[PDB]
Amino acid sequence: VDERLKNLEPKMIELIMNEIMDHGPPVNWEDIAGVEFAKATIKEIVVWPMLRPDIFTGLRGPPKGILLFGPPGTGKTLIGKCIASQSGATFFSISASSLTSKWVGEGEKMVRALFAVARCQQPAVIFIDQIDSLLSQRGDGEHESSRRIKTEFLVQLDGATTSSEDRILVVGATNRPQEIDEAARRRLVKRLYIPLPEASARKQIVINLMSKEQCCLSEEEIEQIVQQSDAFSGADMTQLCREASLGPIRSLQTADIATITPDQVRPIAYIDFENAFRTVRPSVSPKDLELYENWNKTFGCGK
Amino acid sequence: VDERLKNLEPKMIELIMNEIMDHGPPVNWEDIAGVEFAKATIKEIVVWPMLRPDIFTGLRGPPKGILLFGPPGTGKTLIGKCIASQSGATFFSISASSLTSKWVGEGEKMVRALFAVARCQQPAVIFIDQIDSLLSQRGDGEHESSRRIKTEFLVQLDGATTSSEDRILVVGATNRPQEIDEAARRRLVKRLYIPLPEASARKQIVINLMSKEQCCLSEEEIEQIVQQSDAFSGADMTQLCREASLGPIRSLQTADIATITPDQVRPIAYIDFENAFRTVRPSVSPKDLELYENWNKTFGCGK
Amino acid sequence: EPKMIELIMNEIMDHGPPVNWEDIAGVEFAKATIKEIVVPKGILLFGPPGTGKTLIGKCIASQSGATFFSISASSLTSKWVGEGEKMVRALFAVARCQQPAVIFIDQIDSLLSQRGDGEHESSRRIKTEFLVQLDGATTSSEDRILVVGATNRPQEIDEAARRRLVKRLYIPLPEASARKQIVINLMSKEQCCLSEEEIEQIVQQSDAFSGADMTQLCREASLGPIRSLQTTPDQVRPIAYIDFENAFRTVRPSVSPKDLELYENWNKTFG
Amino acid sequence: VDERLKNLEPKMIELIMNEIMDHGPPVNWEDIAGVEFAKATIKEIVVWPMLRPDIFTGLRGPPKGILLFGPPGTGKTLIGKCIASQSGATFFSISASSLTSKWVGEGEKMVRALFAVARCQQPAVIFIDQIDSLLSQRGDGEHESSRRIKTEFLVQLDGATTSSEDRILVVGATNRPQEIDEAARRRLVKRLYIPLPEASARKQIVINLMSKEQCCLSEEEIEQIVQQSDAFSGADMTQLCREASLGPIRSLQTADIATITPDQVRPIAYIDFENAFRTVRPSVSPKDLELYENWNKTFGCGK
Amino acid sequence: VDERLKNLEPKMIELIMNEIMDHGPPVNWEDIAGVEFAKATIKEIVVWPMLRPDIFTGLRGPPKGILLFGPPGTGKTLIGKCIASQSGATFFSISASSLTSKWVGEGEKMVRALFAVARCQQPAVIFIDQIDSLLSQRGDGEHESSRRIKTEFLVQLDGATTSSEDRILVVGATNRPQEIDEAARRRLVKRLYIPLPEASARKQIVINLMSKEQCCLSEEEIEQIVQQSDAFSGADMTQLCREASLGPIRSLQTADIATITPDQVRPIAYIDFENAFRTVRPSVSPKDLELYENWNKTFGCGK
Amino acid sequence: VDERLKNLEPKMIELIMNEIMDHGPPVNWEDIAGVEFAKATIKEIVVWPMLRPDIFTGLRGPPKGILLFGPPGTGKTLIGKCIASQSGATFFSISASSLTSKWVGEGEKMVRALFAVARCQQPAVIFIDQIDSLLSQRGDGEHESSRRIKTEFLVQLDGATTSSEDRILVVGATNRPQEIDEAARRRLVKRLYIPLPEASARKQIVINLMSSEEEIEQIVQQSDAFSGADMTQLCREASLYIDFENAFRTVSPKDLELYENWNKTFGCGK
Amino acid sequence: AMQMQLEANADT
Ligand SMILES: Nc1ncnc2c1ncn2[C@@H]1O[C@H](COP(=O)(O)OP(=O)(O)OP(=O)(O)O)[C@@H](O)[C@H]1O
Ligand SMILES: Nc1ncnc2c1ncn2[C@@H]1O[C@H](COP(=O)(O)OP(=O)(O)OP(=O)(O)O)[C@@H](O)[C@H]1O
Ligand SMILES: Nc1ncnc2c1ncn2[C@@H]1O[C@H](COP(=O)(O)OP(=O)(O)OP(=O)(O)O)[C@@H](O)[C@H]1O
Ligand SMILES: Nc1ncnc2c1ncn2[C@@H]1O[C@H](COP(=O)(O)OP(=O)(O)OP(=O)(O)O)[C@@H](O)[C@H]1O
Ligand SMILES: Nc1ncnc2c1ncn2[C@@H]1O[C@H](COP(=O)(O)OP(=O)(O)OP(=O)(O)O)[C@@H](O)[C@H]1O
Ligand SMILES: Nc1ncnc2c1ncn2[C@@H]1O[C@H](COP(=O)(O)OP(=O)(O)O)[C@@H](O)[C@H]1O
Ligand SMILES: [Mg+2]
Ligand SMILES: [Mg+2]
Ligand SMILES: [Mg+2]
Ligand SMILES: [Mg+2]
Ligand SMILES: [Mg+2]
Ligand SMILES: [Mg+2]
């Protein structure tokens, strides 16, 4: 039935349809090592409704919003990508540039068209990265465009016309949750804190990254690597692995570059990691973590 | 009567006509668990004139304009839905996107067309969600479109052409009432404040939402649950009930979901609510309420 | 151009309930000036919301016995380029053709305001057309015409357009005598019984109350008797002071004292 | 390719294309003196992938994002120019003026258009000079334009849409790295510190710059010149050499300069350098250096 | 030049061109009494390249930057005015009001337009009367517009687009050199100190001022006048001369001044000089001077 | 003359024009009374150029600037009003709050527009009360807008663009002269001290405003270290010889010392 | 000390 798109202009519909992400490289929950409660709740949210809609329909229906917060480089976007790949549903990747428009009135109409289009491809997932830019606290002297966009977003997320039983999920990621509007904050019922990787998380990341690249590492070496790598985030671990991957290249003489000799390169060893530790430093200062903890204790839903 | 719509182009009329909200699932006043005074006021405003128009005409005619303000998630949209369901009159669900156009001099045209169409169908109810986006304080520096729209709204609500006996009602809902323009404030004579639910309201909400699901709850357990849920909003209670309803599913072992019969599910017990309380927190900070009271005593219409 | 003139011709005020001067009560000087001039090309009326400016407009429309035009921003704005000035010219031509003519502009600031950055060319063209047409019509003085309007923020009216409107009037809040007159006029229609002391006490209680607020209070008082009855007209109890006491519970001033100084200083300077 | 540029407007594409830096005079790595570690890292980043795309792809794929920091006038823009010359890739010279605009919703669109255009031309290098103007720590109360621009930049540097390969290098140079945003700091994985030139760097600079002057100095004179010129920045040595070359002109009589031919010019001698030292002094106070060192320890990637 | 001005908006170009300063009355070098080292340096900077472009091309090019600093009234603006005429190049008079604007991003665009227009007309001289206002030290928690303007100035002066053999000169004057940004301070290589006039400077100023007005003064009278006037700035000397010149008018019979003629006025003698001394006092306290000296010892380029 | 106003914002020009005040009731020097050296200096500066412009033009022209420093209520505004009424020149009055604005960069534009509009009419007087507020000592750390406004004012008063024959006089009244920036102090070459009225001045003021010799002398002697505002209030309440004594029976000198020192250092007096 | 932006309007 075209009545859903009757009011919207064709050009806005085309622009929204251009935002659907393609079938990127497959990613599964196994690749995302670390947080376990977040993965469990996300699975309960997404997988269960499709397996048996009859059981979970009604009061047991999934919520319409999710929020992810934490320090930079903790796998929030990785979680979003995994949800897109595994959810088996249309995935929209929205951003600030996709909605804002210089012409008056188009800002809210873009949001309306987005929600209308997502209502036809049910089930659908709308992922907004760095949501703090679009739904910041409503100031006293902000421009009218921002106020109208925020109001339209709030109305679309919750309104009289919704009438429930719509399989539309909105997911947001941010590093500054304290700036999110309370009216928009209540919409994102499930708020998840994603801290830095633990010892098990770091070990799993190292094992996963070293499985692809053949190497001879013993248990003691892995334990030492995990012990030394403290306060590192997932991005820091990936950077450390990439830096260690260059050890064989540097070991050989420069003239080898012209000859390459792909088989000549030695397998990665522990000395490579030893050297890589010097040139890699943690990217997150502890002084920024405190705030997150407080927020997680005040508005978080993690036991 | 095309005479009142003589100077309206068909395209403008179509957009107004297609915005009428069709009759959805029924909602009754008893379904709204909360403040009794607001319910009684709304009933006296809407139902009584319809039943006995002869006695409640002339001076005793219902006023035009109602405002609902309070913290997020206090059931304002639920009151709007109930009014739409019980009024038995044309219901218009207006928003910012509806009345804003990029072309010069069309927002005022849209407002005029909306009011003319509403006058054509009487009795009618016009509901505006997040009215602070359209009717806001007229700043010193702003675009001409916003000022023209605000002035058109003011003229249509109150003007020389406007006259009594027009069964058109305008209902607005907002979370930042202090930003509403004073000229717009004058039109909305009835201001209603909807605070957080109290113990009785929480008990009523729990009873209403839980009666639809088979279970056995002791009176002392219900009292304890109500006592624990302190500072929760209307949506917070619903989220808590939803979280509790998922406990039985988690109780069962993995892989049983695919083939478990609906009957073989344990009813909801007190332990479910005890577990739910851990992962559910209030979504409204108390410090935000201080403003509302100050405004309620200054311009509120409630005793 | 029959279609174009049709829109202008269809904006004339239609028949409605009669309005009389005695109803306004509160503002005697403005009424005196208006009645002296009606039977000074531009008259501007300003004041806090709910001061009866639109009531004055309706009274003039009902009493003057002349063609009355209700023109707003929506009517004089068109998306097509160059049609706004043509429509303004048509409006002025039609007003001149039918004499005498009275043109009322509600929310004048929307049509014309102080020049500001980012203003579109169409608005400036319409403003210039309005000014030139007004000057051309007024200079000859061959045909009678009157243009009046209302606006709650007179400080935003541009000086160029301001000079054309020679007459400026301010309507303050109603006075104790005005409040008593409004009370008696509105309540005398319905069967009521109250003493003079009761009305004096009501006037004393109602301080800084605009006309709209007073009307709302009277409506609440008239509704109170229905609240008294449990779930024919003869059953209505006569309205007493208890009804007013109950009404005062849920009625409060709707105009803040913040901007009163601004209005007072502007009126003293240019009013 | 119109396929990837169909969303953007022609004006944005034209403006972005205007920013391409046309090839200029050639600057080689030998011109830059003193920065061995930074030069080696930049070589590994840029030259190696060109020679062997196959070996360096995958986990060895070159990182995207480089930061340069140090005291003013120590050779950051010189390194940028050398990379532009020797990169063999399209070079974009971006600045705050090009991106920022006075219309709502323009900075984000400008950033997206820039990244798309750089994506079309591969390999590409984007050089943002004085990055602290654009990417600074986010704070409450800032104008929404800056926040939107920052978030758009972050969403372009990483995100779900971003994929491997797609050779694009972003290089930034700044004097106040402590004010860079926490999230943006993660993208700039390789952070380099460029200190004041040492004795060898000063010797190389003076020899190379004075070789063209066609003068004659004895080894002891060069050693003494290096020894005296202590705490001089990169530009200080250039200014000293420039002011020393005017000594022969000053010695010549004022009247004869108009008539004297270029041939009758005394060669530069150590006396000119002695005179120059009397009028040239360091332009960088040692007070501000310490902080940089501390930062280099906390976040620097150097050994 | 359409090629390099096409990008710039025509309105900004017109505003920049409006800054061109009329020649006005000529001001010869000899009119500037006192400073000689600064005068000779400015001569070498500006006059020499014009006469013999071939000789000074290459490594002997003009520095392209000057910063005049000293206590108030020493004659910095007078030197700027003298350069405006003697140099013969296009002169730009830029102040804070010219660049600053309330619209987002207009300041950087104005700076870029100014520099482009200056580059079109060569040779050109840009004089900033109060450089400390626009190039103050960058600090944390400052408005983004000022940071953008400062960074744009730095890039324009010493950016990648900047090329050698370009005839653009920037001259700035300020009473508070200690507040100038170090990065911007680097560009202004030639820093000239203008101290209070010496005895010879005061004598020359007095002689030049009194030459036009006929008077009979002996050498010993001039010597004692110079001795009495100490710690007197050029403005103080001018005010002293102005006050002395009115002595004959004051001594004229009351009510006859209206009907008096210049012929009847007596010449100026030493009698009125003491009376003027009684009414003139130094305007610069000795306390501040020390600071300037220290700065001149640290970063000053004088000998 | 509109050519020199080409680049200015028209609304700014309208605001500056609105800032002008229409001529008030006539006033004379004898009316205010109480100052002799100040009267002589100000009249010499202002009246003389008008009566015989040909002789005074050149090296002996007006200085373009006046400062008045003293305790509160000492008749400072009276001097400015008398100059405005008698000088027969367009009078511009500016306060500290006039230039300040919420938006960035509006102060500099306001100052530029004010100076340009005043330059449109060659004879004009710009009186700026509370000059020490907008023009104050420039510290190491302060608001950017204040620095921009101060520098723009200094440039407008003195700059390369500025040319002789301006014929614009800036009069500034202050109560905290030691907060004035030295650069701004340089512009105001003629600095005058306005002290408390003397015995003869106080007697003249009281006799004139009130409308035997021993009673007048006793009243004058009784009143010591009283400002003009105090005398005005006392006489106003008294009018509501015994009554005068009762009213008399109905500032501090410790701080005044600093003024003297300042008047000794930078004052134009003897 | 704050800046503001503008919104375009189409009048064909
Ligand atoms: N939990 C994790 N397990 C494994 N790898 C991880 C994890 N978290 C992050 N990474 C690695 O970090 C890389 C970048 O992290 P990612 O883009 O997911 O961060 P983010 O949470 O979106 O960051 P930001 O807060 O800056 O927006 C991922 O490609 C992956 O390589
Ligand atoms: N007073 C109430 N009685 C019963 N249910 C309520 C009440 N308040 C809230 N709820 C429940 O909370 C849900 C969400 O509340 P709702 O959307 O009506 O809030 P709102 O006042 O419109 O919020 P907002 O301030 O965000 O616009 C409602 O659907 C209903 O399920
Ligand atoms: N002076 C008055 N006398 C009688 N009724 C008055 C008076 N002032 C206001 N009212 C009442 O106010 C209502 C009409 O107000 P009106 O529309 O004229 O006000 P306004 O100042 O133009 O309003 P706004 O600025 O909000 O559009 C009527 O109820 C009228 O009875
Ligand atoms: N390491 C260096 N080796 C050789 N010359 C150098 C070096 N550093 C600076 N110079 C000289 O200094 C001139 C200007 O320095 P450059 O532009 O590289 O400084 P910068 O570090 O980018 O400064 P800023 O912090 O002001 O942006 C260069 O053209 C070159 O002549
Ligand atoms: N060296 C000098 N020789 C002659 N006159 C001078 C000299 N220095 C200052 N003057 C006089 O000073 C007045 C102009 O001073 P000028 O504006 O140049 O000062 P400045 O140092 O730029 O001041 P500011 O610090 O206030 O910007 C003129 O009277 C000029 O004659
Ligand atoms: N010297 C004086 N002679 C006469 N009246 C004075 C004198 N000084 C002050 N006044 C009176 O005081 C009132 C206010 O003085 P004001 O001009 O505000 O002083 P100041 O400028 O020092 O604040 C004036 O109305 C004036 O009549
Ligand atoms: Mg991310
Ligand atoms: Mg709602
Ligand atoms: Mg009205
Ligand atoms: Mg640089
Ligand atoms: Mg100067
Ligand atoms: Mg005063």
Author numbering:
A (entry chain C), B (entry chain B), D (entry chain D), E (entry chain E): 372 to 674
C (entry chain A): 380 to 418, 434 to 625, 632 to 671
F (entry chain F): 372 to 582, 589 to 617, 641 to 650, 655 to 674
G (entry chain G): 2 to 13
Manuscript text:
To gain insights into the molecular mechanism of FIGNL1-dependent regulation of RAD51, we utilized FIGNL1ΔNE501Q, which forms a stable complex with RAD51 but is defective in filament disassembly, to obtain a structure of FIGNL1 in complex with RAD51, which likely represents an initial engaged state of FIGNL1. Using cryogenic electron microscopy (cryoEM), we determined the structure of the FIGNL1ΔNE501Q -RAD51 complex in the presence of ATP and Mg2+. To improve the resolution of the reconstruction, we focused on the FIGNL1ΔN hexamer for further processing, which was resolved to 2.9Å. The six FIGNL1 AAA+ domains form a spiral hexamer, with chain F at the base of the spiral and chain A at the top. We identify clear density for Mg2+-ATP, bound in the nucleotide binding pocket of chains A, B, C, D and E, in between adjacent protomers. The electron density of chain F is of poorer quality, presumably due to increased flexibility of this subunit. We found additional density consistent with a polypeptide in the central pore of the FIGNL1 AAA+ hexamer. The polypeptide is tightly coordinated by two highly conserved pore loops of FIGNL1 which form a helical staircase. We could fit residues 2-13 of the RAD51 N-terminus, which belong to an unstructured region not observed in previous crystal and cryoEM structures. In this structural model, the highly conserved pore loops encircle the physiochemically conserved hydrophobic/polar amphipathic residue pattern found in the N-terminus of RAD51, via a close network of interactions, which may provide RAD51 sequence preference.
RAD51 recombinase, the central player of several crucial processes in repairing DNA and protecting genome integrity, forms filaments on DNA, which are tightly regulated. FIGNL1 (fidgetin-like 1), an essential gene in mice belonging to the large AAA+ ATPase family, has recently been shown to prevent persistent RAD51 foci formation, prevent replication fork instability and suppress ultra-fine chromosome bridges(17–20). Previous studies have identified three functional domains in FIGNL1: a N-terminal domain containing a largely unstructured region responsible for localization to DNA damage sites and for interactions with other proteins, followed by the RAD51-binding FRBD (FIGNL1 RAD51-binding domain) and AAA+ ATPase domains (18, 19). The cryogenic electron microscopy structure of FIGNL1 in complex with RAD51 reveals that FIGNL1 forms a non-planar hexamer and RAD51 N-terminus enclosure in the FIGNL1 hexamer pore.
